[PDB]
């Protein structure tokens, strides 16, 4: 279920890792090939994946309309890249050593555990208040004063791309 | 010593908010607080008491001027007798800055 886990973390659930459109990723039931008090960490690890899918389900649908919103989407694709990069790194590890345990990935994947919940609610405000127009430039900036250095440096990048639209329309007009 | 290295490394990452607004109040001439977190609600931490007077007298004086990276300095000071005399070398960053504003 090692390789089964990584695929579930990429957006492809299975039988052992069921999917729900309401709750999200979750362990189905008890299995005899897993420790009785181990299912805990997997559910906590699955919460990292549940955020990831709702990203893609939002990205693919692009849903509200406007260039600033659409360009904010592509800006969201850049920040998720190290998550794609770091997860792929584990593949080289287990192919090398096949006896690794489930504890190591949690020790490796702690940094992304904190970045998503702060940036995920930023999407929720947009889908719940219909933030249309240039006002998206402030909702990203209002959370840009956050305390977490990584969360600050992440939304910093989206702002560096979201302004890429304003500067163009500003230039072609002024 | 290892227990002091922990508390110190735990200290800097918790006083980072105040050192930001304090600097932000100085150079940007306005106090930008959230939920009235700062002690100056526009009951006091003695951490910065020995120089507090030089702050307010620089903050308010700066606001009357516009109408007419501090944390990134304290950390390099650690690179070049702990937290009492060592802390007494932080204020030269907050005092010379003040001297320019009032001057």
């Amino acid at each position: 279920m090692i390789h089964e886990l990584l695929l579930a973390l990429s957006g492809y659930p299975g039988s052992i890792f069921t999917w729900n459109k309401r709750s999200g990723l979750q362990v189905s039931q008890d299995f005899p090939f897993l420790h009785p008090s181990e299912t805990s960490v997997l559910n906590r690890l699955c919460r990292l994946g549940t955020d990831y899918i709702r990203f893609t389900e939002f990205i693919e649908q692009y849903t509200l309309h406007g260039i600033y919103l659409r360009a904010f989407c592509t800006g969201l694709d850049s920040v998720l890249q190290p998550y794609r990069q770091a997860l792929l790194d584990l593949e080289q590890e287990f192919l090398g050593d096949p006896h690794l345990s489930i504890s190591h990935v949690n020790y490796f994947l702690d940094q992304f555990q904190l970045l998503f919940p702060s940036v995920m609610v930023v999407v929720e405000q947009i889908k719940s208040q219909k933030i249309h127009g240039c006002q998206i430039l402030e909702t990203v900036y209002k959370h840009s004063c956050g305390g977490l250095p990584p969360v600050r440096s992440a939304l910093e990048k989206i702002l560096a791309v979201c302004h890429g639209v304003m500067y163009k329309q500003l230039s072609a007009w002024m | 010593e290892q227990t002091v290295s922990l508390l110190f490394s735990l200290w800097v990452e918790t006083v980072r908010p105040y050192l930001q607004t304090v600097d932000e109040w100085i150079v940007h001439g306005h106090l930008w607080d959230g939920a009235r977190e700062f002690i100056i609600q526009r009951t006091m931490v003695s951490f910065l008491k020995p120089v507090l007077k030089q702050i307010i007298m620089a903050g308010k004086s700066m606001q009357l001027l516009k109408n007419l990276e501090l944390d990134d300095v304290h950390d390099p000071l650690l690179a070049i007798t702990f937290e009492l005399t060592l802390r007494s070398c932080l204020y030269p960053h907050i005092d010379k800055q003040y001297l320019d504003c009032c001057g």
């Binding site: 009785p36 008090s37 299912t39 805990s40 960490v41 906590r44 345990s101 504890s103 190591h104 949690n106 020790y107 702690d110 940094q111 904190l114 919940p117 956050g146 305390g147 977490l148 250095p149 | 922990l6 490394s9 735990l10 990452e13 918790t14 980072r16 908010p17 959230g34 939920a35 977190e37």
Partner: protein, 105 residues
């Protein structure tokens, strides 16, 4: 009175999980936010009571790490100070976790 008669190495693995801050463990079953050793645990040696003694000490350490994990949880799910305080606490845990995780290897 019946007992589970767990093996020896299994305890260390469980102890590492308690150090990690994970919950729902076959040993150290908390009830009211207070980790507490079970009652049917026994090894071939250690006369069933010293085990309740040695685990009781490590349990006292689980309380220190379980409560902190409850604190970090109640911040993730604009104070700008507590949120800036946990990031220091959280940073310490990752490095501490690596030493415990390494031992498991």
């Amino acid at each position: 009175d019946d007992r589970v008669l767990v093996t020896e190495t299994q305890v260390i693995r469980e102890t590492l999980w308690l150090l990690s801050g994970v919950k729902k463990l076959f040993i150290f079953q908390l009830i009211d936010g207070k980790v507490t050793v079970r009652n049917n645990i026994i090894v071939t040696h250690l006369t069933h009571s010293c085990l309740r003694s040695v685990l009781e000490q490590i349990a006292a350490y689980g309380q220190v790490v379980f409560r902190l994990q409850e604190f970090i949880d109640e911040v993730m799910g604009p104070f700008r100070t507590y949120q800036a305080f946990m990031w220091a606490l959280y940073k310490y845990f990752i490095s501490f976790k690596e030493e415990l995780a390494e031992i498991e290897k």
